[PDB]
Amino acid sequence: LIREKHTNLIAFYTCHLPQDLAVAQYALFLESVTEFEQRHHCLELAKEADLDVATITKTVVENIRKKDNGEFSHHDLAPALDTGTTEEDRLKIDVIDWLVFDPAQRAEALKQGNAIMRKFLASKKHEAAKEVFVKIPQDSIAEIYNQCEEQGMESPLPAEDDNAIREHLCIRAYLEAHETFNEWFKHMNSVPQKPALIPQPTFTEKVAHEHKEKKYEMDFGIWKGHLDALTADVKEKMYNVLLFVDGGWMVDVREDAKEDHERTHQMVLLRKLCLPMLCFLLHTILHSTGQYQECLQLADMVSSERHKLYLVFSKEELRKLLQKLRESSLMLLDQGLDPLGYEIQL
Amino acid sequence: KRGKLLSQPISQHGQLANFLQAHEHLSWLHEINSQELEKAHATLLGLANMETRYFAKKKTLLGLSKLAALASDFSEDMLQEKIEEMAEQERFLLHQETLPEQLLAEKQLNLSAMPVLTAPQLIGLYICEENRRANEYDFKKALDLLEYIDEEEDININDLKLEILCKALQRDNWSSSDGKDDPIEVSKDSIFVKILQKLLKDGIQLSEYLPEVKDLLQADQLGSLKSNPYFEFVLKANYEYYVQGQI
């Protein structure tokens, strides 16, 4: 019936099974549905048949989360290019719908949505992580409190979901710190080209160089007036992630939580993929705009006992950071300041 | 322009180091460039001890010294020694880092451009009139800063301790209530009682750590409170309650 495509039949032929088997076989059906109108219709046909719709949709999403027999290797740090959203990523973007059709699953949509975003962010698929972020409706953080004040949730505030809402807020702050960098980088590469000097030019060609340079003076003034603004925004977003509140970015707060070692390993890995990378981006943003003393204050941020970012770099990356810190330290000396950017008195 | 001092050939580094022994504020940049990171730790720590002109520069020198010690092949014992020797100077500088943004604004001070301050100077800021939000955390810092004063300052630590406690008692409103109310219940919102409750939680003997109730009442700093018999009673009742509560 799955292989002629189920309309109205399988649900009744599935409630004649124990719940473990009924859930598993109706999930094994819904794992084949890509047609959005048929998704809704074939959930209501299960809700007309006393089936466990909630463990069914969780089983569809978790089986699709589990189809990657891929361990988190450390060689794939490599500069892969153009790793955009494939059909095998879309079958994991177009799976969160199963927990969004019914409001009673917004918690699970966020718990599983985080797990698929953890995969895509580690896989450098930042747009695919943003496609999953857009599958989670923006009311969901309030709806998880609505579903706790009327009657009750897995606990009077769940220790899975307080940590999951905190993790979704970490993921949003990381996507803000990527989108603002992507637009800063698009804009930084747009730089107005200075009008070339013609050798031995006529009077007409000199006026037709003035009437190029006196446009470059405007174009470059506008372009820097946008660059310094984008350099403030991306710097808010990279500080919001590197200095993220108490516990810090992709760290929990509820020690009354249940163990997930898949989640905990992925979060401890993502802190080591993302936070060193953001520090190398932020140094490059500050240094390429001439903000050379803020490039050095990254050392106090990385060594800070509040955020302990020195625990998420390799020794080789702390050497790379001490090498980049010295790039700005030399540009301050070539500006006539001290090695840390202060006034030299004489 | 000096970047050129460091980009010299390795075959001259055994001359360069034996000349940078006359300029410590550049020697660490050649020590790191030689991977002699065990020197760079100590050079940047010496420079951090000498850098009093800029608070944010002393912090960056310790941040670089600590990132040399977290990159050198020190043994696990010497590495814990040089983590802890630096962690106490981070704890000291955290008292200057955590100065209230209103106290900094009212004194027109900038953390990026102000000098390093000594413990009596940090105490003197925290307890001042301009700290118009001073609380049981700032009046805890102002007592904990008494443990960062050397035996060669011409400064009686006990008279600082008296003046800190007097200025806590002058932030607390020792006016009388509407005649229905217990002064050992009402005192529990006072910052003076909240620092006693901190010292008790944090393990300290109030029977040995506090000045005498005779002489906290003979200190002149209290001014207008030194004529208030409700303050005279409530101070004694809370000293009696919190010191007898430890016997």
* Residue of B167, B105, B166, B102 lying closest to B133 (CA atoms): B102
3-state secondary structure of A80: coil
What is the C-alpha separation between A119 and A85, in angstroms, rounded?
12
What is the C-alpha separation between B156 and B147, in angstroms, rounded?
13
How many C-beta neighbours within 10 Å does residue A109 have?
Answer: 26
* Residue of A102, A95, A110 lying closest to A32 (CA atoms): A95
* Residue A310 to residue B57, Cβ atoms within 8 A: no
Q: In the numeric block, which tokens belong to residue B194?
A: 């909240």
How many C-beta neighbours within 10 Å does residue B136 have?
Answer: 17
* Residue B66 to residue A319, Cβ atoms within 8 A: no
Kindly tell me the burial class for residue A4, based on how many C-beta atoms sit within 10 Å of its own C-beta (0-12, 13-18, 19 or more). exposed
Q: Which of A300, A313, A319 to mutate to test the interface with B (most CBs of B within 10 A)?
A: A300
DSSP state of B107: T
Angle at A90 between CA A88 and CA A96, to 5 degrees: 120
Interface of B with A (CB under 8 A): 1-3, 6, 25-26, 29, 32, 53-54, 56-57, 59-64, 66-68, 70-71, 87, 90
Residue where the block lists tokens 């035996």 = B151
> Resolution, in Å, please?
12.0
CB A37 within 8 A of CB A78: no
Show residues of chain B in contact with A322, CB under 8 Å: 32, 64, 67-68, 71
Radius of gyration of chain A (CA): 27
CB A267 within 8 A of CB A167: yes
What is the C-alpha separation between A200 and B123, in angstroms, rounded?
72
Q: In the numeric block, which tokens belong to residue A179?
A: 């989108």
Interface of A with B (CB under 8 A): 296-297, 299-300, 302-303, 305, 310, 315, 318-319, 321-322, 325-326, 329-330, 333-334, 338-340, 342
Show residues of chain A in contact with B70, CB under 8 Å: 310, 315, 318
Q: In the numeric block, which tokens belong to residue A276?
A: 């060193």
A–B CB contacts, 8 A cutoff, strictly below: 57
Residue where the block lists tokens 């797990």 = A115
* Residue B70 to residue A310, Cβ atoms within 8 A: yes
CA distance to A42, A64, A98, A302, per residue, from A31 (Å):
12, 8, 10, 44
Residue where the block lists tokens 């917004």 = A106
Counted residue by residue, chain B has a size of: 247
What is the C-alpha separation between A284 and B100, in angstroms, rounded?
32
- The answer to whether the Cα torsion of B198, B203, B206, B209 is positive or negative is negative
CB A252 within 8 A of CB A166: yes
Show residues of chain A in contact with B1, CB under 8 Å: 333-334
Q: Which of A301, A303, A342 to mutate to test the interface with B (most CBs of B within 10 A)?
A: A303
DSSP state of A138: T
What is the C-alpha separation between A97 and A36, in angstroms, rounded?
9
CB B71 within 8 A of CB A322: yes
3-state secondary structure of B247: coil
Q: Which residue of B has its CA nearest to A326?
A: B29
Angle (deg, nearest 10), helices A106-122 and A140-149 = 150
* Residue A340 to residue B57, Cβ atoms within 8 A: yes
Q: In the numeric block, which tokens belong to residue B235?
A: 């101070």
Q: Which residue of B has its CA nearest to A301?
A: B63
What is the C-alpha separation between A84 and A125, in angstroms, rounded?
6
**CA-CA-CA-CA torsion for A130, A131, A132, A133, nearest 10 degrees?**
40
Query: Which technique was the structure solved with, according to the deposited record?
Result: cryo-EM
* Residue of A78, A176, A66, A55 lying closest to A119 (CA atoms): A66
What is the C-alpha separation between B2 and A111, in angstroms, rounded?
54
DSSP state of B244: H
* Residue of A79, A69, A76, A26 lying closest to A51 (CA atoms): A26
Q: In the numeric block, which tokens belong to residue A275?
A: 């936070």
**CA-CA-CA-CA torsion for A5, A11, A16, A21, nearest 10 degrees?**
70
Q: Which of B70, B73, B79, B83 to mutate to test the interface with A (most CBs of A within 10 A)?
A: B70
Q: In the numeric block, which tokens belong to residue B212?
A: 């005498």
- The answer to whether the Cα torsion of A47, A49, A55, A56 is positive or negative is negative
Q: In the numeric block, which tokens belong to residue B205?
A: 């003997």
DSSP state of A70: -
Q: Which residue of A has its CA nearest to B27?
A: A339
What is the C-alpha separation between A33 and A5, in angstroms, rounded?
9
Q: Which of B33, B54, B60 to mutate to test the interface with A (most CBs of A within 10 A)?
A: B60
CB A174 within 8 A of CB A274: yes
* Residue A334 to residue B64, Cβ atoms within 8 A: no
Show residues of chain B in contact with A302, CB under 8 Å: 63, 67
Q: Which residue of B has its CA nearest to A310?
A: B67
What is the C-alpha separation between B102 and B114, in angstroms, rounded?
15
